[PDB]
């Protein structure tokens, strides 16, 4: 279902989810109910997306070209 | 507080060193990262919900 | 005698605790691949109980409780199992203390009627039909779904359908019998209509006239067959009388209206729809007044059903439906014409409309309402404990045993919401004993507070019917003392 949206990111959306599974198991082994861990994951992601959207980048304007030509240069590094 | 412009210091995807990204041009669309975090949390919540079985 | 009763207790308690975590909206989903591959991922325990491989008698009687509670009120399916299992678990102390199961069962009956009369006046009842609080209960029920954006699309339609016919069934309560329902694949969700009378969804494609003001209706279930004798006489009877809209049934054979008789029935172009649905056939006949007659010599002049507007009309632009008004006694089951291009907006709309039906029939069979979510169970566990203190004899513990077994519904609601169960339950008891009834556990935000401010409320008859059914089956399983195979 992630794969139909943007293409890549599939290994990351598997790996981060698996680490959330692992750390949630380590939490619920400490007499924590999984309801609390699920709601904490929900609040963490809801806060994290606002953390991301406060600190995004729109430098790639029509004025942002030296960073863009540097992106082009570093995309073909050691060739 | 003054060093807010030490924020995008990510990993070198080729050689693995702490490196700039905004000057280096290492970029990824924000909707990709947001949707991947959303779907990873949804997957984690769904598999954590299947819990109440001795199995 | 006791060794089989104990096995009944243990089996029913084990089959009740297999769905005990699924209580409440935070009840987690299951997975039992018992049998031959059952991927049973669902948070609702009713369909878990309907797929449970059950061999024990007392474990099967709670599966019967599930369907009984779904028939009576449509809600609280896991509650009637958890209350019964906790009660049967609490019977073991009364059995090992020395009380015979007859005294246990009759004291549970006394505690049941005491709990019903305690719950029935501690409510906040409605005084009139009160369509505002019907829409309030719809916000409690028809929302928290994918039809949350279809809630105003669906709640006042059924509210107005009960406004049309406040029907005299079980003390003028909502039956399954207001104005006949249909559903059509395709269309938009806004393409629902409230009708007056019979609707058909199936594809009738007549180039000629099916639009008759005196649309005479018959039910001839005699289709055509293959050996002319028993073939054309019903169409000659159609040319006699003139039943211009007749629903066809293929009860005889498969070639229903062959071109010999089909052009005979397209020389006047009758309505032709085959393979009519069997449970709705008798409701269609209750609507129309014609007779469901397959014997073509039993077609009489008093079989002429009445209809006013009968058209193969493209309702909502393209849906070629056959709607009918002006019948003998139409109106068979509350109309929500479920149209939807997507499939989930069909099935969830119809399922939530049935949920709305089973709660508005709950709201008006008994016209009271309480704050749901663990508050009346704590209230019962307090008042029945006081009553068992006042009560004498060997029943004095059993009603007390009825009291503590009531406490599993908040505690699971405390546990499934992640709270520490025992401390939150006794803090709820301390709050209720000096405060109010409506204090409980808001699961929708996860915290103990006054629920009537936080609005997790339910009609009274859900709780009353669940307590009645659970006490009935607990009574029966206590009275059950012998089994025998090999007839």
From Swiss-Prot, chain A:
Coiled coil: none
Positions annotated to bind ATP: 9-11
Signal peptide per UniProt: none
Amino acids binding Mg(2+): 8
Annotated S-S bridges: none
Record localization: Cytoplasm, Cytosol; Cytoplasm, Cytoskeleton, Microtubule organizing center, Centrosome
Highest taxon, organism lineage: Eukaryota
UniProt binding sites for ADP: 9-12, 78-79
Disease tied to this protein: Intellectual developmental disorder with polymicrogyria and seizures: An autosomal dominant neurologic disorder characterized by a broad phenotypic spectrum. Main clinical features are developmental delay of varying severity, intellectual disability, seizures, and polymicrogyria. Additional variable features are non-specific pyramidal or cerebellar signs, and visual impairment.
Record-stated family: Belongs to the TCP-1 chaperonin family.
Function: Component of the chaperonin-containing T-complex (TRiC), a molecular chaperone complex that assists the folding of actin, tubulin and other proteins upon ATP hydrolysis. The TRiC complex mediates the folding of WRAP53/TCAB1, thereby regulating telomere maintenance. As part of the TRiC complex may play a role in the assembly of BBSome, a complex involved in ciliogenesis regulating transports vesicles to the cilia.
Assembly and oligomerization: Component of the chaperonin-containing T-complex (TRiC), a hexadecamer composed of two identical back-to-back stacked rings enclosing a protein folding chamber. Each ring is made up of eight different subunits: TCP1/CCT1, CCT2, CCT3, CCT4, CCT5, CCT6A/CCT6, CCT7, CCT8. Interacts with PACRG. Interacts with GBA1. Interacts with DLEC1.
Name of this chain's protein: T-complex protein 1 subunit alpha
Source organism (scientific name): Homo sapiens
Taxonomic path: Eukaryota, Metazoa, Chordata, Craniata, Vertebrata
Segment of the intact protein contained: 81 to 159 of 556
UniProtKB/Swiss-Prot annotation, chain B:
Subcellular location, record wording: Cytoplasm, Cytosol; Cytoplasm, Cytoskeleton, Microtubule organizing center, Centrosome
Record-listed ADP binding positions: 28
Location of N6-acetyllysine modifications: 17
Residues passing through the membrane, by range: none
Phosphoserine: residues carrying this PTM: 14
Protein purpose: Component of the chaperonin-containing T-complex (TRiC), a molecular chaperone complex that assists the folding of actin, tubulin and other proteins upon ATP hydrolysis. The TRiC complex mediates the folding of WRAP53/TCAB1, thereby regulating telomere maintenance. As part of the TRiC complex may play a role in the assembly of BBSome, a complex involved in ciliogenesis regulating transports vesicles to the cilia.
Disease connection: Intellectual developmental disorder with polymicrogyria and seizures: An autosomal dominant neurologic disorder characterized by a broad phenotypic spectrum. Main clinical features are developmental delay of varying severity, intellectual disability, seizures, and polymicrogyria. Additional variable features are non-specific pyramidal or cerebellar signs, and visual impairment.
Family: Belongs to the TCP-1 chaperonin family.
Quaternary state and interactors: Component of the chaperonin-containing T-complex (TRiC), a hexadecamer composed of two identical back-to-back stacked rings enclosing a protein folding chamber. Each ring is made up of eight different subunits: TCP1/CCT1, CCT2, CCT3, CCT4, CCT5, CCT6A/CCT6, CCT7, CCT8. Interacts with PACRG. Interacts with GBA1. Interacts with DLEC1.
Protein name: T-complex protein 1 subunit alpha
Organism: Homo sapiens
Gene: TCP1
Shown residues within the full chain: 478 to 532 of 556
UniProtKB/Swiss-Prot annotation, chain C:
Stored InterPro entries: Chap_CCT_delta, Chaperone_TCP-1, Chaperonin_TCP-1_CS, Cpn60/GroEL/TCP-1, GroEL-like_apical_dom_sf, GROEL-like_equatorial_sf, TCP-1-like_intermed_sf, TCP-1_chaperonin
GO cellular component: cell body; cell projection; centrosome; chaperonin-containing T-complex; cytosol; extracellular exosome; melanosome; microtubule
Coiled coil: none
Binding, Mg(2+): 75
Entry keywords, A to Z: Acetylation, ATP-binding, Cell projection, Chaperone, Cytoplasm, Cytoskeleton, Hydrolase, Methylation, Nucleotide-binding, Phosphoprotein
Catalyzed reactions: ATP + H2O = ADP + phosphate + H(+)
The keyword Lyase is annotated on this UniProt entry: no
Record flagged with keyword Ubl conjugation: no
Cross-referenced Pfam families: Cpn60_TCP1
MF annotations from Gene Ontology: ATP binding; ATP hydrolysis activity; ATP-dependent protein folding chaperone; protein folding chaperone; RNA binding; unfolded protein binding
Modified residues (N6-acetyllysine): 236, 250, 267, 274
Main localization category: cytoplasm
Residue numbers binding ATP: 24, 76-77, 145
Binding site for ADP: 24, 76-79, 143-145, 373, 458
EC number(s) recorded for this UniProt protein: 3.6.1.-
GO terms of biological process kind: binding of sperm to zona pellucida; chaperone mediated protein folding independent of cofactor; chaperone-mediated protein folding; positive regulation of protein localization to Cajal body; positive regulation of telomerase RNA localization to Cajal body; positive regulation of telomere maintenance via telomerase; protein folding; protein stabilization
Subcellular location: Cytoplasm; Melanosome; Cytoplasm, Cytoskeleton, Microtubule organizing center, Centrosome; Cytoplasm, Cytoskeleton, Cilium basal body
Chain ranges passing through the membrane: none
Phosphoserine modification, residue list: 7, 155, 173, 392
Top class in the EC scheme: hydrolase
Subunit structure and binding partners: Component of the chaperonin-containing T-complex (TRiC), a hexadecamer composed of two identical back-to-back stacked rings enclosing a protein folding chamber. Each ring is made up of eight different subunits: TCP1/CCT1, CCT2, CCT3, CCT4, CCT5, CCT6A/CCT6, CCT7, CCT8. Interacts with PACRG. Interacts with DNAAF4. Interacts with DLEC1.
Family: Belongs to the TCP-1 chaperonin family.
Record-given protein name: T-complex protein 1 subunit delta
Gene encoding the protein: CCT4
């Amino acid at each position: 279902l992630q794969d139909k949206e943007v293409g890549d990111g599939t290994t990351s959306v598997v790996i981060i989810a698996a680490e959330l599974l692992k750390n949630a198991d380590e939490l619920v082994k400490q007499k924590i109910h999984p309801t609390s861990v699920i709601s904490g994951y929900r609040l963490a992601c809801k806060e994290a997306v606002r953390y991301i959207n406060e600190n995004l980048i729109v430098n790639t304007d029509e004025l942002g070209r030296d960073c863009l030509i540097n992106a082009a240069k570093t995309s073909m590094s050691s060739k | 507080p003054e060093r807010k412009n030490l924020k995008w210091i990510g990993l070198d995807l080729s050689n693995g060193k702490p490196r700039d990204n905004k000057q280096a041009g290492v970029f990824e669309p924000t909707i990709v990262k947001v949707k991947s975090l959303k779907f990873a949390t949804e997957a984690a919540i769904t598999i954590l919900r299947i819990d109440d079985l001795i199995k | 005698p006791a060794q089989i009763r104990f096995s009944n207790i243990s089996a029913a308690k084990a089959v009740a605790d297999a769905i005990r975590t699924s209580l409440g909206p935070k009840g987690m989903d299951k997975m039992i691949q018992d049998g031959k591959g059952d991927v049973t991922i669902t948070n609702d325990g009713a369909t878990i109980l309907k797929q449970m491989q059950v061999l024990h008698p007392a474990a099967r009687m709670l599966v019967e409780l599930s369907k009984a509670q779904d028939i009576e009120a449509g809600d609280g399916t896991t509650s009637v199992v958890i209350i019964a299992g906790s009660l049967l678990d609490s019977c073991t102390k009364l059995l090992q203390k020395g009380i015979h199961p007859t005294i246990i069962s009759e004291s549970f009956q006394k505690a049941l009627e005491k709990g019903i009369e305690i719950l029935t006046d501690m409510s906040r009842p409605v005084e009139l039909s009160d369509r505002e609080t019907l829409l309030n209960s719809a916000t409690t029920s028809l929302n928290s779904k994918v039809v949350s954006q279809y809630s105003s699309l669906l709640s006042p339609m059924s509210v107005n359908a009960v406004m049309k016919v406040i029907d005299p069934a079980t003390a003028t309560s909502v039956d399954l019998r207001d104005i006949k329902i249909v559903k059509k694949l395709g269309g938009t969700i806004d393409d629902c209509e409230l009708v007056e009378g019979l609707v058909l969804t199936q594809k009738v494609s007549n180039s000629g006239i099916t639009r008759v003001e005196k649309a005479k209706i018959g039910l001839i279930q005699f289709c055509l067959s293959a050996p002319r004798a028993y073939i054309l006489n019903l169409v000659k009877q159609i040319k006699k009388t003139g039943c211009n809209v007749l629903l066809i049934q293929k009860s005889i054979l498969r070639d229903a209206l062959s071109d010999l008789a089909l052009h005979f029935l397209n020389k006047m172009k009758i309505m032709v729809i085959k393979d009519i649905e069997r449970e709705d056939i008798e409701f269609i006949c209750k609507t129309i007044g014609t007779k469901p007659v397959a014997h073509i010599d039993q077609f009489t002049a008093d079989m002429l059903g009445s209809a006013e507007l009968a058209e193969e009309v493209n309702l909502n632009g393209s849906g070629k439906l056959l709607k009918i008004t002006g019948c003998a006694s139409p109106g068979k089951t509350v109309t929500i014409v479920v149209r939807g291009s997507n499939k989930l907006v069909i099935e969830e709309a119809e399922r939530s409309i049935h949920d709305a039906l089973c709660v508005i029939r709950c709201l008006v069979k008994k016209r009271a309402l309480i704050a749901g979510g663990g508050a009346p169970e704590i209230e019962l566990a307090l008042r029945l404990t006081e009553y068992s203190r006042t009560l004498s004899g060997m029943e004095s513990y059993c009603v007390r045993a009825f009291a503590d077994a009531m406490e599993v519904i908040p505690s699971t609601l405390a546990e499934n919401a992640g709270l520490n169960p025992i401390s939150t339950v006794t803090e709820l008891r301390n709050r209720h004993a000096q405060g109010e009834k409506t204090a409980g556990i808001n699961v929708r935000k996860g915290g103990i507070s006054n629920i009537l401010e936080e609005l997790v409320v339910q009609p009274l008859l859900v709780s009353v019917s669940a307590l009645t059914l659970a006490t009935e089956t607990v009574r029966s399983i206590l009275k059950i003392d012998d089994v025998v195979n090999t007839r």
